[PDB]
Amino acid sequence: GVPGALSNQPAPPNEAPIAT
Amino acid sequence: GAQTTLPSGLQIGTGVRPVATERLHSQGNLSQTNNSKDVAIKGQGFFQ
């Protein structure tokens, strides 16, 4: 939703891969 | 743009790049070597 709103479900983990 | 005044637009270049280095195939001068095994080509030809 809104970038700063409230949700009940945790945000998915963010990973930064070198190559895809 | 749509045209007394100078044209508009800005086309920036990118730089220089060598495309091809050529050899000038013009017959050179002859130098005398008394040995019987050297020969010189008179014109457009190459030894195989």
């Binding site: - | 100078l6 044209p7 637009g9 800005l10 086309q11 920036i12 990118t14 495309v19 014109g43 457009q44």
Partner: protein
């Protein structure tokens, strides 16, 4: 707050000019190169109250079309044109284009190409007999003599398409090949006719027209202008930093 942008624009466009100048100086030895001229134009912001904001934008009004100093290379395929003359070569997209690089090479099968672009004569691209000596006259007449053939068989082959067009009527394309402008295309047709009054010299190659004095003066002016604009920017930023204190009740 926006006065920090006006100066910024100038600084940014200064860099643009520098790029153009570098693009000229990198081509100091390029044969038949036409140096691009740069010019800043001022654009005022049309709006309510005083127009105390006028930005800059760089542009390239065509190229400098003064012929360069000639290079005498003893190669009969090398040509140099009379002032305001152009060779017609087929471009990449099957269309005509104009160039000054007169370094003509002969392909394995006899096609005349300049920088890989097949040269176009009065009848189209030129087909030269397999491996023959080529002599170009002062009007573009091509004589081929399979080296070793009776010298009275110096048979002519064709004639180059030499085009007269001043610098105002021609614009550069992204491939480096010059073409006609839209107005010149409307007023002089699409494909220009060959002018027999243009003289072409064989055995000389034309170099670039990059004037180093102009380049040096342009660099000095660009550096000074960049320093002035960065200073304006610092002054404006400091003033706004001091002014932000007015909001504390």
């Amino acid at each position: 707050d926006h006065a920090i942008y006006t100066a910024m624009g100038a600084a940014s466009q200064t860099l643009n000019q520098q790029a153009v100048t570098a693009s000229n100086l990198a081509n100091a030895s390029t044969p038949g190169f036409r140096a691009q001229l740069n010019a800043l134009r001022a654009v005022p912001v049309d709006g309510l109250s005083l127009a105390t904001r006028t930005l800059v934008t760089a542009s390239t009004p065509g190229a400098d079309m003064t012929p360069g100093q000639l290079d005498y290379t003893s190669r009969p395929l090398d040509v140099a044109l009379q002032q305001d003359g152009w060779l017609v070569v087929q471009a990449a997209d099957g269309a005509e284009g104009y160039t000054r690089n007169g370094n003509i090479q002969v392909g394995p099968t006899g096609q005349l190409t300049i920088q890989g672009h097949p040269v176009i004569g009065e009848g189209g691209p030129i087909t030269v007999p397999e491996g023959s000596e080529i002599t170009i006259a002062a009007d573009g007449t091509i004589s081929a003599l399979n080296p070793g053939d009776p010298p009275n068989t110096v048979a002519p082959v064709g004639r180059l398409k030499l085009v007269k067009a001043e610098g105002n009527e021609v614009q550069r394309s992204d491939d480096g090949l010059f073409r006609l402008t839209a107005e010149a295309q409307a007023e002089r047709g699409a494909v220009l006719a060959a002018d027999p009054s243009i003289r072409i010299m064989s055995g000389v190659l034309e170099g670039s027209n990059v004037k180093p004095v102009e380049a040096m003066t342009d660099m000095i002016a660009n550096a000074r202008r960049f320093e002035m604009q960065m200073k304006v920017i610092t002054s404006v930023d400091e003033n706004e930093g001091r002014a932000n204190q007015l909001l504390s009740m």
